[PDB]
Amino acid sequence: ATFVPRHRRPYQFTQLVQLSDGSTFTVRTTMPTALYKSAKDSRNHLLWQPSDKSLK
Amino acid sequence: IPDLAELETRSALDAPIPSEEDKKEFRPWKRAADRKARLPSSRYQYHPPKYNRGPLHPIQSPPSSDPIARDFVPGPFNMPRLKETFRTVMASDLMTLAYIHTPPGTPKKEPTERLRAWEGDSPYFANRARRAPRGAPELPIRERDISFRNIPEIKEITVSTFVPLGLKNPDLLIVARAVLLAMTGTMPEMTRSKNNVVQWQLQANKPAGCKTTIYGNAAWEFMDRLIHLVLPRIKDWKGVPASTGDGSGNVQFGLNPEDVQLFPEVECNYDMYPAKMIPGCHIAIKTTATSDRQAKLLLQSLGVPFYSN
Amino acid sequence: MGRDHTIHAAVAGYVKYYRDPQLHPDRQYIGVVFNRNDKLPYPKDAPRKRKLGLVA
Amino acid sequence: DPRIINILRHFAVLSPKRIPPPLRFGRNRYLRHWTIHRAWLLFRRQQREQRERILMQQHQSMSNACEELRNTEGPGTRETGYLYRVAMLKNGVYGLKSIPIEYASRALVETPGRQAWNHEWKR
Amino acid sequence: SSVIAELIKEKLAARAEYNARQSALRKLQQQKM
Amino acid sequence: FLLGIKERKLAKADRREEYRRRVREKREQR
Amino acid sequence: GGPELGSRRRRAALATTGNLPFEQLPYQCFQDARKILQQDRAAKIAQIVKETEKIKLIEARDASEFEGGEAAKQTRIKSLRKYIEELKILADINDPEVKRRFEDGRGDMTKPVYRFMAERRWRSMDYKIIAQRISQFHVVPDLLPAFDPTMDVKLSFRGYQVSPGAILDSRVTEVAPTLRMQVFDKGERLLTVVVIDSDVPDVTHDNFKRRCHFLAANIPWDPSKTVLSLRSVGDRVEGDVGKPWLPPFAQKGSP
Amino acid sequence: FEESFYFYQKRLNERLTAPFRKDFYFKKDTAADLDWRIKLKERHGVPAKDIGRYNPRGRMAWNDEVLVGSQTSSRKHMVEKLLADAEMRVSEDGEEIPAEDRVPVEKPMPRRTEADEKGDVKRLDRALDKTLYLVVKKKAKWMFPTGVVPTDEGLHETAARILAESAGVNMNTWIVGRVPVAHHVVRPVFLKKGEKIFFLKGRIMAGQADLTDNLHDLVDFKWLTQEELRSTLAEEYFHSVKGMFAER
RNA sequence: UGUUUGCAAUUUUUUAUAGUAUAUAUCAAAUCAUCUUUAUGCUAUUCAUAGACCUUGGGUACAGUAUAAAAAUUAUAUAUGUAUUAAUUUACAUAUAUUUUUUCUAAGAAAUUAGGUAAGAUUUUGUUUAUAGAGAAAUUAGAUGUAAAAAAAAAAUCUUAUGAGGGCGGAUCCGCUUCUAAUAUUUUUUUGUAGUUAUUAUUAUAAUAAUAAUCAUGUUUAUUACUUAAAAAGCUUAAUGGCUUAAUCUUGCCUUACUGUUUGAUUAACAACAAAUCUUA
Ligand SMILES: NC(=O)c1ccc[n+]([C@@H]2O[C@H](COP(=O)([O-])OP(=O)(O)OC[C@H]3O[C@@H](n4cnc5c(N)ncnc54)[C@H](O)[C@@H]3O)[C@@H](O)[C@H]2O)c1
Ligand SMILES: [K+]
Ligand SMILES: [K+]
Ligand SMILES: [Mg+2]
Ligand SMILES: [Mg+2]
Ligand SMILES: [Mg+2]
Ligand SMILES: [Mg+2]
Numbered sequence A: 001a002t003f004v005p006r007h008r009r010p011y012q013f014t015q016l017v018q019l020s021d022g023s024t025f026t027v028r029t030t031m032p033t034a035l036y037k038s039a040k041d042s043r044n045h046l047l048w049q050p051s052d053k054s055l056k
Numbered sequence B: 001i002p003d004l005a006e007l008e009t010r011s012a013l014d015a016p017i018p019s020e021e022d023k024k025e026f027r028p029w030k031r032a033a034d035r036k037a038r039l040p041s042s043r044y045q046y047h048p049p050k051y052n053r054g055p056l057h058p059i060q061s062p063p064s065s066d067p068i069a070r071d072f073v074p075g076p077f078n079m080p081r082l083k084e085t086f087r088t089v090m091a092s093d094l095m096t097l098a099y100i101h102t103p104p105g106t107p108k109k110e111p112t113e114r115l116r117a118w119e120g121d122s123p124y125f126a127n128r129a130r131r132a133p134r135g136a137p138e139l140p141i142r143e144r145d146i147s148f149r150n151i152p153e154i155k156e157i158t159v160s161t162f163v164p165l166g167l168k169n170p171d172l173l174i175v176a177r178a179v180l181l182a183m184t185g186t187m188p189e190m191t192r193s194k195n196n197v198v199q200w201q202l203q204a205n206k207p208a209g210c211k212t213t214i215y216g217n218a219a220w221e222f223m224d225r226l227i228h229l230v231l232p233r234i235k236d237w238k239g240v241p242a243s244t245g246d247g248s249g250n251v252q253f254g255l256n257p258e259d260v261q262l263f264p265e266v267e268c269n270y271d272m273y274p275a276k277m278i279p280g281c282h283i284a285i286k287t288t289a290t291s292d293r294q295a296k297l298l299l300q301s302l303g304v305p306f307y308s309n
Numbered sequence C: 001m002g003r004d005h006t007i008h009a010a011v012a013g014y015v016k017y018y019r020d021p022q023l024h025p026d027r028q029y030i031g032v033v034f035n036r037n038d039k040l041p042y043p044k045d046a047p048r049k050r051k052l053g054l055v056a
Numbered sequence D: 001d002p003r004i005i006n007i008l009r010h011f012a013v014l015s016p017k018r019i020p021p022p023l024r025f026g027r028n029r030y031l032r033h034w035t036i037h038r039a040w041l042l043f044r045r046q047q048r049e050q051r052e053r054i055l056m057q058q059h060q061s062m063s064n065a066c067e068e069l070r071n072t073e074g075p076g077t078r079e080t081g082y083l084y085r086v087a088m089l090k091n092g093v094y095g096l097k098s099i100p101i102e103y104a105s106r107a108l109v110e111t112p113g114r115q116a117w118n119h120e121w122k123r
Numbered sequence E: 001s002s003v004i005a006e007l008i009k010e011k012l013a014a015r016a017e018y019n020a021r022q023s024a025l026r027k028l029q030q031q032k033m
Numbered sequence F: 001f002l003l004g005i006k007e008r009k010l011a012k013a014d015r016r017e018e019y020r021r022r023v024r025e026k027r028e029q030r
Numbered sequence G: 001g002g003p004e005l006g007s008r009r010r011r012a013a014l015a016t017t018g019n020l021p022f023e024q025l026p027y028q029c030f031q032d033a034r035k036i037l038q039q040d041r042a043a044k045i046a047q048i049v050k051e052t053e054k055i056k057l058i059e060a061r062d063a064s065e066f067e068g069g070e071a072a073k074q075t076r077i078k079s080l081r082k083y084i085e086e087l088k089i090l091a092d093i094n095d096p097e098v099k100r101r102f103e104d105g106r107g108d109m110t111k112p113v114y115r116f117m118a119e120r121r122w123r124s125m126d127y128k129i130i131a132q133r134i135s136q137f138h139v140v141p142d143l144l145p146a147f148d149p150t151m152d153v154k155l156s157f158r159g160y161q162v163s164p165g166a167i168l169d170s171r172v173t174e175v176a177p178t179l180r181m182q183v184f185d186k187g188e189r190l191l192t193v194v195v196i197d198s199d200v201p202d203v204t205h206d207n208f209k210r211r212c213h214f215l216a217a218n219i220p221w222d223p224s225k226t227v228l229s230l231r232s233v234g235d236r237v238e239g240d241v242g243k244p245w246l247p248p249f250a251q252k253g254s255p
Numbered sequence H: 001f002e003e004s005f006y007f008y009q010k011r012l013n014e015r016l017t018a019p020f021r022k023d024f025y026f027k028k029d030t031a032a033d034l035d036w037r038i039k040l041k042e043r044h045g046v047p048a049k050d051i052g053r054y055n056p057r058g059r060m061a062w063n064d065e066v067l068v069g070s071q072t073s074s075r076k077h078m079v080e081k082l083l084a085d086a087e088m089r090v091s092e093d094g095e096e097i098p099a100e101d102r103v104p105v106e107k108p109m110p111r112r113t114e115a116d117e118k119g120d121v122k123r124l125d126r127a128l129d130k131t132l133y134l135v136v137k138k139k140a141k142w143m144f145p146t147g148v149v150p151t152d153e154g155l156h157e158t159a160a161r162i163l164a165e166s167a168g169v170n171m172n173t174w175i176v177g178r179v180p181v182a183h184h185v186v187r188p189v190f191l192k193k194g195e196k197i198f199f200l201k202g203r204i205m206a207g208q209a210d211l212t213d214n215l216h217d218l219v220d221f222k223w224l225t226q227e228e229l230r231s232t233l234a235e236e237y238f239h240s241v242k243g244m245f246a247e248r
Numbered sequence I: 001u002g003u004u005u006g007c008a009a010u011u012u013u014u015u016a017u018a019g020u021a022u023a024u025a026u027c028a029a030a031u032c033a034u035c036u037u038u039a040u041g042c043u044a045u046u047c048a049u050a051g052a053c054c055u056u057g058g059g060u061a062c063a064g065u066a067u068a069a070a071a072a073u074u075a076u077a078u079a080u081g082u083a084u085u086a087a088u089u090u091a092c093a094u095a096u097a098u099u100u101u102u103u104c105u106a107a108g109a110a111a112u113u114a115g116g117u118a119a120g121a122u123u124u125u126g127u128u129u130a131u132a133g134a135g136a137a138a139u140u141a142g143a144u145g146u147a148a149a150a151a152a153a154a155a156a157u158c159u160u161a162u163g164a165g166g167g168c169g170g171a172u173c174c175g176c177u178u179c180u181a182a183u184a185u186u187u188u189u190u191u192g193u194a195g196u197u198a199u200u201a202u203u204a205u206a207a208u209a210a211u212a213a214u215c216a217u218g219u220u221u222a223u224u225a226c227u228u229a230a231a232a233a234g235c236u237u238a239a240u241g242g243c244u245u246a247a248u249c250u251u252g253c254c255u256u257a258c259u260g261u262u263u264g265a266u267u268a269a270c271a272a273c274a275a276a277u278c279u280u281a
């Protein structure tokens, strides 16, 4: 008699993530916050933007 | 046409879209209140079994896609931006980057039998057991070429934490299980030690960690947070080692405890976890790729830097 | 087959040692046929050969 | 200890006995979801057949160009099949610097940034 | 609930009838035993 | 049980209405 | 509000709610999902007319043109015909009322769609248990060398449905049973029913012989017929009874 | 349908996900807790901001579907709510900020830029949701930057050199490989010499094309989509490069 | 009124009606603890009502962009101010235990339980690749390939048949026997190898030819079937043999690890007998 397991998932919200360039996209997360402003991200990093001179 | 005659004449899919006068009179909340009674129940009262008792057992379980099932998971809630990116821009770039032209009428390649047979005139040969895999003990999977019918992709991700000190302070495991819960959004499964080492105080068959696996979109959304919000914030980070890869298309690397608390899900409530109890995790990205160079090429397309190692 | 793997006769007949590649590719079996001139394994499409074993 | 109890209370809410039960739809309600589920998987099929159509068309464009290129002789004295044999080389394709990180890092967004495009970029 | 009350009364009567038959037969078994 | 809570609540509502009525009349006489 | 309208919930929901077809219920996702299937059914119907006219061109084509002759022309119309039959089923497999009609037993079995779901339902459960009875009871190879059922047959004695391979009493099985058959392919055909007892003991020669307890032929059957009472095989329904029903029995002692 | 489907599945999740424990994210009697409780009260208890008002439990949990023409499931109404819930409603001391003294959060940028309105075909921020192609005019037929292949260089080395000549070096670009993605063959006129053009795919990440002092006799340039190309380019030249196109 | 509230949807049975056995409804059981107050409370607004900003209150709201019109409603003891009574009666509020709603301290975080039966899973060991802390030695993720539109037809070689109750000697007994059927075999004689999507070529959007892809009406975490040497792991304990299609493992329900008598064997157990072992009714 194989047991039929049920999914135990926490509560998930829809979140707006604003990157350091002003770009915004929607995601699915467990945190209750509505907007996540990211000051430091890939758009503001030298390892991802080697050609940018402001970040040099 | 006789073919069109065999179709259902009373087609509900060819009906007109509802009107407004009826839509203004359709108030499911007003029906309940006005009725002032409980509508009789239907005689169809089949509920999924809690145990699958066999193919021929009278009561059967429905497929997972049935909303009334016990394992039904609500469908997609949004389109991961890294899945639409890869499919829209990078799917063809990999196809164009790694493309070898096959002449028009090239004969099909016959795959060689890797478990060789003993063939010859010697009488003993006939019934000899097949030879062992030449070289390694286990056969390694053969690499498939990146064509329009095989484009590497992300399939699942397994995050795991090994906390040996949880055998002395049981509070380190409870905290680890909650971090992997908020980081991934699933209920981790506790794991147990397997070896006995007195020097490290490791005892076998005792819960010393947990793990989570996320599939589908949740795997793409977990990479977006990692590549673009977490990794850029690690201090003095060099990149994923160039040695990662199990030889089958899976990439693995680990995060420090001070880098696991950079996750947006862990930092918001960082004050709810005891001090110095946030663990580090091992991240094993499983891809549809079939090689180590195909996997590292796939990750490079998602914006993951590698460094010599 | 007995508890100690001893093979026993269930019917009166003649012992036969044979191999059935249809049932299992690498097993050898021991059967009991009612007629001495029968050959095992019986073709999978031939009717079962059985004896009444009753008295009126 | 009080902080740990909050952790345990979170798992207690996820316990199999506590989580909500399986849904219980009526006929019309069930049928309505059946069409939504039937239409979604059909929509995925259309997106799949289209997504795969473009990949085949693009691949057939290369095969037509490479097959033609394989027959061309040139430039000038160069023997037949030079440019084809040179185009099929995979030098640096599977290295570390294969794909520029500036291109791959950028991913699609729902709305653009303050500066959608940078036209002042200088080498 | 005008006509629905008639149906509910039909639903209540059917159950009340069985509850009576079940009790009218449970007593009989307690006499045979 | 639910209807019980309802009846007990409706019964208490009548007591509250009776109290509000009785006290209201007494205030005017004063 | 009588029993002819359905169950109590229907008769109740049919007097407390408004009159509006199910497909016209104003629900966002249900009406957006019904529009995707609408313009798709039109694309399938537009494909049946493109393949229907494509056969005429091949039909009115000299066999000499085809490098393979009449052999390559009939194998190309064969794939085209089978591709059209699949399109006729894919044009209503998403219909919500076709599923309701078939589940309610009010489905027209003269259409390919309903015969497709009825067969898909039979194979889901009833086929699996009957495929097991043929094997475990050694009906094969005793009676037939190999046998794969293609239709449903449910027999009931005096109204009571008997499960396959159930030991019935000698009094119950004294009258001809009623066969609740169901065929899943189109057209009308003649059926032959045969009841055979495979374990009649022959003590003189120490073996088992087979005895026919019923035999009939020339029984017309279409996918819209369900019940067949073996009692009136020549009186009401057309057929030729070779041997009337013989009450099954078994002498004491034999298996 | 995709917006309606998301909203549908988002509500079925409300009926199957474990409840939300505010005690795991907000400490009781803090500025964050008081803020959550005020906004939660306006949402009528629903901790989610994108599913309207729906109670997974109770007597009215069956009424989960939304009716036709509902603004609730739209992406515009979703963002509006997600942005009206990010504004701090409680001061750092625990007192509700007046309605008029509340600072709204900076809203996202519009999807259609000024170039989309102006219709400037020389801008790269136009049609942000579609692929743009660099089409060049030669002193005249519109085309892609091409050039004769010398004996020393190959196809990929030749394409890179021509691009910097025709378009300048002020653009960050990647040649996706060495394989040509399309070809256009002009048969010879028996005479005139035929032309076998082999196109390589390139991707631009930053910069702008510069036609000043270009070696080839180029006059103008414009970044066009896949629909505008067929109106500008010739029928035989377009039919040979349309296979390389993408969905958007 | 158990079962989700918009409508005959699972299996069998009970009863009733029409009907002559069927058909519909109904009932019960199996499968599943879905949570159910139609508002009595809350919210906003307004109005009296103290007057230096108070209690209690009366209205108002018209609900698909659903709504104030339930995001989760209990009881009881003490005692306090307002306030009421024949009364610690009643209403209000807060002081605070106490209980109910199982809804808030992870057993789906713990235990190597070994037999009967049913279902499901089928290399688990070692080796090897990679992987924060992590090292010779800690955890986790991996490690074969193929197939899934659909074939038809001609003869021949055996072998089988409770097939033609075949023919002939002595229906079903037997060695000879032709014919048919089934599986197998032939390197055998072959024929066909589409349709669909797209490409290219010619032809006047369609037709034709070639090339490539193609299990897919299905919640891609696809699925299903087959395949993946040997040793090793596991199977109460050494060794040998065996099992991987179960004798291993997991789960459900169980305790035939039953009473009496008895069959045929171990080429007549141990080269006798006895204590034994397997097995049948
Ligand atoms: N699954 C099938 O029925 C099927 C049929 C033929 C081929 N395939 C093969 O499947 C592979 C590719 O996967 P796929 O096409 O089956 O699935 P998919 O990639 O389209 O879907 C995978 C996941 O993405 C989600 N998703 C898809 N579209 C979405 C959207 N618009 N918005 C939000 N979420 C969305 C899906 O619901 C699922 O969670 C290929 O090899 C293809 O040939 C699958
Ligand atoms: K899709
Ligand atoms: K067991
Ligand atoms: Mg092996
Ligand atoms: Mg191992
Ligand atoms: Mg190490
Ligand atoms: Mg055992």
Ligand SMILES: [Mg+2]
Residues within 6 Å of the ligand: I268
């Ligand atoms: Mg002896």
